Amino acid sequence: VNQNAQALNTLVKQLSSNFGAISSVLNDILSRLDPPEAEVQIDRLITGRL
Amino acid sequence: QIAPGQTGKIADYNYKLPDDFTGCVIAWNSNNLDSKVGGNYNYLYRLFRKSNLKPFERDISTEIYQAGSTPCNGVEGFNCYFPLQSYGFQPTNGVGYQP
Amino acid sequence: GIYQTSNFRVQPTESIVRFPNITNLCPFGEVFNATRFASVYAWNRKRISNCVADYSVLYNSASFSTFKCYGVSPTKLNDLCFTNVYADSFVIRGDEVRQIAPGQTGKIADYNYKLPDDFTGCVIAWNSNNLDSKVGGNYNYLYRLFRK
Amino acid sequence: QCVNLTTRTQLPPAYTNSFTRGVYYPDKVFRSSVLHSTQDLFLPFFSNVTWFHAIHKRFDNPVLPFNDGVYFASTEKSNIIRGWIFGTTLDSKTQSLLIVNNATNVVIKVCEFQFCNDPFLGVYYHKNNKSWMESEFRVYSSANNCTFEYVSQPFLMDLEGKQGNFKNLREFVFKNIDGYFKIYSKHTPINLVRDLPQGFSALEPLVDLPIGINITRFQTLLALSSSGWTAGAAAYYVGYLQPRTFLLKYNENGTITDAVDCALDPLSETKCTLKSFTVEK
Amino acid sequence: YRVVVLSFELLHAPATVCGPKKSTNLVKNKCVNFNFNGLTGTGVLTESNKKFLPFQQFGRDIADTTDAVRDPQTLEILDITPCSFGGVSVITPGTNTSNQVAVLYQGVNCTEVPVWRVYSTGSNVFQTRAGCLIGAEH
Ligand SMILES: *[C@@H]1O[C@H](CO)[C@@H](O)[C@H](O)[C@H]1NC(C)=O
Ligand SMILES: *[C@@H]1O[C@H](CO)[C@@H](O)[C@H](O)[C@H]1NC(C)=O
Ligand SMILES: *[C@@H]1O[C@H](CO)[C@@H](O)[C@H](O)[C@H]1NC(C)=O
């Protein structure tokens, strides 16, 4: 039980990292840049989460 | 502002290039060809719009634009303008302002 | 057997937004509707900061002869915001209201008050003939004609 | 007007051990029954803090630095400490900032002054009226340029009081980060003679201001013809903050109850790496 | 002519006069998308009993996910719950026998199943500990 809870916990916890992008919140990247630049950030985010 | 994804008056209101463009652009000055000291006001551009237009779309409507909150009718009114505007094309201008 | 497909979601319906009970306005009445302003040679300067600015009520008002902004579109002033505000108030001739634009020439633009080539701000002018004008001529208002 | 008071006895600087003091709420979130690990500017545990006191024959109000905020503590009665100054030069070579708790109002402002060597406020004592009347206000010599000012509501604060033991334990911590001046504070009733006690109590936030200037030094303002005086018994202590990592324990109601310093000694490091207050064999 | 010139500036120092904030009404008990003082999210809001301190605004969880907020205009506590989701399952005998099927919405209390539709109110809605079963008889 302990190992299962810990693995799930860290999975959820990996959603608040940067991976090199500007911010960890997708809405803030979308609502602060233009589509020709937000793409290069969203790509980093999706790579890390994958 | 012609390159894909750029911004500004032209790229935003009259001519929009798509982001997946696969083509070339050719540009050269024609000052001594079509510029007159009196001013070639045959050339007009759109200054205002309710919103930006889709890629490779062409707008020709001449209905007056409204800037202020108040509505407008007729042909002219305060803070309600004819959106078209002409260039001051003369050879005497500095670099860039030539056609 | 039994197979899996097609996740689903409840798909929220409407939107909502909230903010604090904002109440501390800027005293515009003391700079726009003051009893008397200064002359062009001594344009009065008043600073505004630390308050709430509402440009809608002044942009929709039509009693103003001219409302020309250069650094911001008129509708966007109610969506952006600032570090400092300064108001330069004065009184001029009705024919010299076109000289106050940045980079122009003329006696007022060259002797009294000039605007920089990259002025970020706005100019609001209105006629108040019946407010401070008299039959005998309110000579208290005067300008500069000679300067080095 | 401002004159130097030199009638004192001389003593060396004194140091004292700050066991567990100077923990504040790093942010505005709420949590319940949790252990959270934070990194921020704190006052290291069991550090040595500088100690200044005004007794009877002593009048000590020197200029001390201000780097990465400071923890200022006071064991006092009769409200003798009143003011605070800040600025890069404090001499109109650069901007300057001022906080004061007058007997009537609390004043805050940024301007360009020129402070004397020993500015102070002076309250007369029992001049046939039983009312210690504040009459001396010698902070600066001028105020050239101002970019922001403010003053709060007037009030009444007693300028009298004599106790055998200091009752007010006032703790303050100040920081200046990226143009925001932050002030956290807390008040406690204590019965101790000449020391800062043992105990745990966190400091809530009180104020944030958008000043935006460089601050490097500071100085206190103390409550006292041009020579001769009487200062009420009072003591204040100064400590400095450093970047550390702490482990904070939130109870059921979201109020901090205990903390652990993850760099003091190896046992605490073990506690910190396991994220618990008890470690098994 | 009386003239006034505004000489403000942009985007170089912490602002001091900003102004432009407007607020709508508050709703409850339906999945909506909200913005509380720049906290953007989506979910359903309910009345809670958590006891914030006077200076605290948000509330967070073990995994650092917000689950409680304080209404800026009236000082009250709202609990946030994400609205439902799950997978869909098709129970079928082979196509060699029949073209009839049953549908399982797993992990959903089918008081709100509807949000092909015919298998959303078809011939029954049977509740089981694994979810809502539609098209099969008890
Ligand atoms: C702190 O100051 C006291 C003063 O006596 C001294 O004994 C002690 O060693 C000092 N500790 C540190 C870490 O500087
Ligand atoms: C938490 O606060 C409640 C009242 O809000 C109080 O009844 C309770 O005793 C507090 N917690 C503890 C551990 O005392
Ligand atoms: C099974 O029988 C019970 C009576 O013992 C009855 O209440 C219930 O409705 C029946 N279930 C079904 C699915 O018919």
Residue numbers in the entry:
A (entry chain B): 952 to 1001
B (entry chain C): 409 to 507
C (entry chain A): 311 to 458
D (entry chain B): 14 to 69, 77 to 244, 254 to 310
E (entry chain A): 508 to 622, 633 to 655
The authors write:
The spike mediates SARS-CoV-2 entry into human cells, induces humans’ neutralizing immune responses, and is the basis of current COVID-19 mRNA vaccines. The spike on mature virions is a clove-shaped homotrimer (i.e., its pre-fusion structure), with three receptor-binding S1 subunits sitting on top of a trimeric membrane-fusion S2 stalk. Each S1 subunit contains a receptor-binding domain (RBD) and an N-terminal domain (NTD). The RBD is present in two different conformations: standing up for receptor binding and lying down for immune evasion.
We also determined the cryo-EM structure of the prototypic spike ectodomain (Wuhan strain plus the D614G mutation). As a control, we also prepared a prototypic spike ectodomain (Wuhan strain plus D614G mutation) in a similar way. As a comparison, for the prototypic spike, 50.3% of the spike particles were in the one RBD-up open conformation based on a 3.2 Å map, and 49.7% of the spike particles were in the closed conformation based on a 3.0 Å map. Sodium dodecyl sulfate polyacrylamide gel electrophoresis of the two purified recombinant spikes showed that almost all of the omicron spike molecules and about half of the prototypic spike molecules had been cleaved by furin, suggesting that the furin motif in the recombinant omicron spike ectodomains is more efficient than that in the prototypic spike ectodomain. Compared to the prototypic open spike, the omicron open spike had significantly increased buried interface between the lying-down RBDs and their neighboring NTD and between the S1 subunits and their neighboring S2. Structural overlay of the omicron open spike and prototypic open spike revealed that compared to the prototypic open spike, the NTD and the SD1 of the omicron open spike both shifted towards the neighboring S1 subunit. Moreover, a partially disordered loop (i.e., loop 853 ) in S2 of the prototypic open spike becomes structurally ordered in the omicron open spike, mediating contacts between S1 and S2. As a result, the omicron spike has a stable open conformation, in contrast to the loose packing and mixed conformations of the prototypic spike.
